[PDB]
C-alpha cells in the first residue's frame, strides 16, 4: 500500500541517519585544531576586464589557465586573454538570456544556455575564421542552469525541470537523464576523473550521480535553503556547497556526511559561487554582499575578503594551475585576483 | 614592448571593442517589455494585437520605436530564480482576464482565478527587483465580462462589493482592486487599459505608456526627479 511504502521510506531514512551518526566519531574541527592557520590572505586586483555592457552571469576558465570565457546578458559570450586583457572572441548569442557558460577542456568549443531551454555548442577553431554554432541541444523543459564538458563529444547539463542530462553532442540526443531532484537544479560540478558529478538543487539537497550508470548514489542534506553553487574538492573525495541561508558546507563522499559549516554572524547574504584553491586549503565563495570571502577550508575561519565589485558577485573560478581567481559580477566587470 | 602578432592581437581586441560598443548603443535604443499574466488570461490575443519552449521573444516597430516583448509563460519552474534577469526592463505588461471573476482554477478548486491573478500581481508589483519598474495593466475580455456581469454579480468574487451590476462600476472596482496592490505608489506607476479591439489602440496605449516611462527615466537621469 501507499502508507506502507511511506512507512518503509521513513524507516530507511531513520536507518540512513543512524548509520551516518554511527560513524561520526569526531568532527573536522577536532582534528584540524592543531595545524597552523593560513594567516591573512590578501589578493589584489591584477586585471580588470572592461568589455561587458550588462550583468555577467557565468565565467569559465580554460585548461591552459590563460583563456577564459564569460557570458553576459547583453547577448555576448566573450573569450578573454587574461594575461594581456585582450579579447580573443566575441560571440553574439541567439538568445540573450544566458545563465551559464562552459569552456571545453580541449579548448575547441564553448557552450552556453539559459532561459531558452537550449544548450548551444559553439566551435572556435573553424577554417572560416569566425565562431559558428556547431550544435544546439534541446530537450530540457526548464531553464538551463549549468553545463560542463566531459570531452569534445559529451556534455552534462542541469536544468530547471528538476533533471540533469548527459548529451552526446554530435548526434544531439540525451544519452542519459538523471532524475530524482524535486527542485530546480541550480549548479553541477564534475569530479576530476569525470565519472561522478554532484548537483545542488532548490530542495536543499545535493546528489552524487554516476555518469556511466545514470543513477543517484548518495543524497546529502543539511542546507536550509536553495543550493546555488557546488564544487568538488581537488582530490574528488569531498565537495562544498553554497546556499541561500548564508552558509557554505563541506560534505564528504566516503563518510556520507557534512564535515564543515562555513558561516559568520556578520554574513546574511546568499552564496552564488564557490570554488577551491589548487591544494583545497582555501574555499572561495561569492556572496550577494558584493564581496568574496576566502575561508580556511580546514578551520572555517574567514581568511580574507576580495572586495572589488559594485554589485553581486555572480560567478567565480580558479585556474587549473591555481595562479589566479577570476570573479565576475552584475556590474559587468570581471576581475583577476592574485 | 609588444611583438608584431601582439600588436595585431591588440588591434583585433580594439575592433571587437568597437563592435561591442556599437551593438550596445543599438541595444540601448530598444524597449524591453516583460509580458506577464495568468493561465489563459488573454496574453496570446495581446501578442497578436502587438504584431499587427522557453522565452518567446516578439519584435515590433511602432512609430519608429523598436519594442522587444519577452513572454515567460512557458517557464513552469520557480519564478524567483530567473526573475532577476528582467531587472532592467522598461515595463511589465500584465494581462488580466476580466471574465475570470467567477471561474475557478483548473489546477486547484476553491481558488478564484481573479484572486490568483491578484496574488500574482501582488508578487510581481512589490518584488524587490521591480521597485521602480512601471506596470502596464491590460484588462482583457471586457465584452465577455459585460455579458457575464448582468447574469452573475461580482459579489461572488469580491464580497465587499457594494456598487451596481453595471459594466462601468464593476470594471472600475476591479481596476481599483488591482491598482491598490501597489505598495510603492511613489516610485512606480500603473497604467490601465481595457484591450480595445480597435486596431492600433492597444499598441498605441503601450506606446504612450512607454513614452511616459522614458520621460520619467530621463527626468531621473537629469536630476530633476
Amino acid at each position, epitope marked *: 500500500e501507499l502508507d506502507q511504502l511511506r512507512q518503509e521510506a521513513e524507516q530507511l531514512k531513520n536507518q540512513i541517519r543512524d548509520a551516518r551518526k554511527a560513524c561520526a566519531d569526531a568532527t573536522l574541527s577536532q582534528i584540524t585544531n592543531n595545524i597552523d592557520p593560513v594567516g591573512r590572505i590578501q589578493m589584489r586586483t591584477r586585471r580588470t576586464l572592461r568589455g561587458h555592457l550588462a550583468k555577467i552571469y557565468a565565467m569559465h576558465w580554460g585548461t591552459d589557465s*590563460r*583563456l577564459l570565457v564569460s557570458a553576459s546578458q547583453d547577448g555576448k559570450l566573450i573569450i578573454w*586573454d587574461s594575461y*594581456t586583457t*585582450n579579447k*580573443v*572572441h566575441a560571440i553574439p548569442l541567439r538568445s540573450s538570456w544566458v545563465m551559464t557558460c562552459a569552456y571545453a577542456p580541449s*579548448g575547441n568549443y564553448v557552450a552556453c544556455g539559459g532561459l531558452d531551454n537550449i544548450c548551444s555548442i559553439y566551435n572556435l*577553431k573553424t*577554417r*572560416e*575564421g*569566425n565562431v559558428r554554432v556547431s550544435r544546439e541541444l534541446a530537450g530540457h523543459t526548464g531553464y538551463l542552469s549549468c553545463c560542463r564538458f566531459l570531452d569534445d563529444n559529451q556534455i552534462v547539463t542541469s536544468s530547471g525541470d528538476t533533471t540533469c542530462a548527459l548529451w552526446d553532442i554530435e548526434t544531439g540526443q540525451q544519452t542519459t537523464t538523471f532524475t530524482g531532484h524535486t527542485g530546480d537544479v541550480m549548479s553541477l560540478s564534475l569530479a576530476p576523473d569525470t565519472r561522478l558529478f554532484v548537483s545542488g538543487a532548490c530542495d536543499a539537497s545535493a546528489k552524487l550521480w554516476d555518469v556511466r550508470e545514470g543513477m543517484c548514489r548518495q543524497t546529502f542534506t543539511g542546507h536550509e535553503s536553495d543550493i546555488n553553487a557546488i564544487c568538488f574538492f581537488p582530490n574528488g573525495n569531498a565537495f562544498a556547497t553554497g546556499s541561500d541561508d548564508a552558509t557554505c558546507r563541506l560534505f564528504d563522499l566516503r563518510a556520507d556526511q557534512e564535515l564543515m559549516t562555513y558561516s559568520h554572524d556578520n554574513i546574511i547574504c546568499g552564496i552564488t559561487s564557490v570554488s577551491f584553491s589548487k591544494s583545497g586549503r582555501l574555499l572561495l565563495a561569492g556572496y550577494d554582499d558584493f564581496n568574496c570571502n576566502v575561508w580556511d577550508a580546514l578551520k572555517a575561519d574567514r581568511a580574507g575578503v576580495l572586495a572589488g565589485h559594485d554589485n553581486r558577485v555572480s560567478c567565480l573560478g580558479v585556474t587549473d594551475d591555481g595562479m589566479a581567481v577570476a570573479t565576475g559580477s552584475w556590474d559587468s566587470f570581471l576581475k583577476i585576483w592574485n | 614592448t609588444l*611583438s*608584431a*602578432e*601582439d*600588436k*595585431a*592581437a591588440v*588591434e*583585433r581586441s580594439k*575592433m571587437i571593442d568597437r563592435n561591442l560598443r556599437e551593438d550596445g548603443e543599438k541595444a540601448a535604443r530598444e524597449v524591453k517589455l516583460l509580458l506577464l499574466g495568468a493561465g489563459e488570461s488573454g496574453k496570446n490575443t495581446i501578442v497578436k494585437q502587438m504584431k499587427i519552449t522557453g522565452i518567446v521573444e516578439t519584435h515590433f516597430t511602432f512609430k519608429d520605436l523598436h519594442f522587444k516583448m519577452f513572454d515567460v509563460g512557458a517557464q513552469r519552474s520557480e519564478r524567483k530564480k530567473w526573475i532577476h534577469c528582467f531587472e532592467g526592463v522598461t515595463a511589465i505588461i500584465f494581462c488580466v482576464a476580466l471574465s475570470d471573476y467567477d471561474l475557478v482554477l483548473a489546477e486547484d478548486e476553491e481558488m478564484n482565478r481573479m484572486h490568483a491573478s491578484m496574488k500574482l500581481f501582488d508578487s510581481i508589483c512589490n518584488n524587490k527587483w521591480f521597485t521602480d519598474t512601471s506596470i502596464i495593466l491590460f484588462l482583457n475580455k471586457k465584452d465577455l465580462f459585460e455579458e457575464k456581469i448582468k447574469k452573475s454579480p461580482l459579489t461572488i468574487c469580491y464580497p465587499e462589493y457594494a456598487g451596481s451590476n453595471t459594466y462601468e462600476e464593476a470594471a472600475a472596482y476591479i481596476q481599483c482592486q488591482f491598482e491598490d496592490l501597489n505598495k510603492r505608489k511613489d516610485t512606480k506607476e500603473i497604467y490601465t487599459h481595457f484591450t480595445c479591439s480597435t486596431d492600433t489602440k492597444n499598441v498605441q496605449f503601450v506606446f504612450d505608456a512607454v513614452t511616459d516611462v522614458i520621460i520619467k527615466n530621463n527626468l531621473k537621469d537629469c536630476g530633476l526627479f
Partner: single-chain antibody
Amino acid sequence: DVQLVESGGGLVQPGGSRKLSCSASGFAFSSFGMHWVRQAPEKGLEWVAYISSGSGTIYYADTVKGRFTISRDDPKNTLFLQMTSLRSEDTAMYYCVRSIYYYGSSPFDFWGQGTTLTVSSGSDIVMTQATSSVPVTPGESVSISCRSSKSLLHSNGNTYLYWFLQRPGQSPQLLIYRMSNLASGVPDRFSGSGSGTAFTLTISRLEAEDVGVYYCMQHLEYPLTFGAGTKLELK
C-alpha cells in the same frame, strides 16, 4: 570552401602601372589580415605588403615602399595591390595570403594560387637556410636547418618562426607556426624544434608528397623575411 583567386597579371612595360585583385570566397574576409608575397621566377619568396583587418595598419617592404599600394574592399571580399612605376625587379608570381592574429591563431595558413606579372625590358632580420639541396629517399628522416641573424625568441615566450612548404607547381603551404605548433591538416611526422636562433624541421618517414622547397619565415619584426629555401628532391 576557402579560396583566394588572384587576377590582373600579364605583361607590363617598364614604368607602367597594373592593379592586382584577390577575390576571397568561403571565409570571413573582414576579420583576416592580408599579405601580398611575391616570388621571383628562379628565386625564393619575398614579402611585399600587409593590410590589417579593418585596414588600421598598412606595412610595405622597403623595395616597394611608395610605388605600391595595398587596399581592401570588405563588402566585395576583395584585396587590391595597385602597382605604379614597375621596374624589371617586379617580375614575379604574386600570392595573396590570409593571416589572422589572436592568441593561439595560425597566421599565413592559406595561400592563393597566385598571378604572374612579367615586366619586360639594413636592420632587417636575415634568415639563413644554409643547405639548398638535400637528396632524400622515401621512408627516411631528414632535418632542415634555418639560422636567424637576430634571436627570434620574444620576451613573452613565443618564437615567431614559420615553416612553409612549396610543392612543385603549387602555392606555399603552412606546416609549422611559431616554431613548434603543427598547422591544421598537416601530418603528424612534421616536427619543428628551435633554440632562439637555430631551428630545425624534422620530417620522419618521408613520403613522395614531401618533396619540394621548404622556407623559414620570421614574424618577429616587419618586414617579414624568408629564407632562400631548401629543396628536397627524389633519389
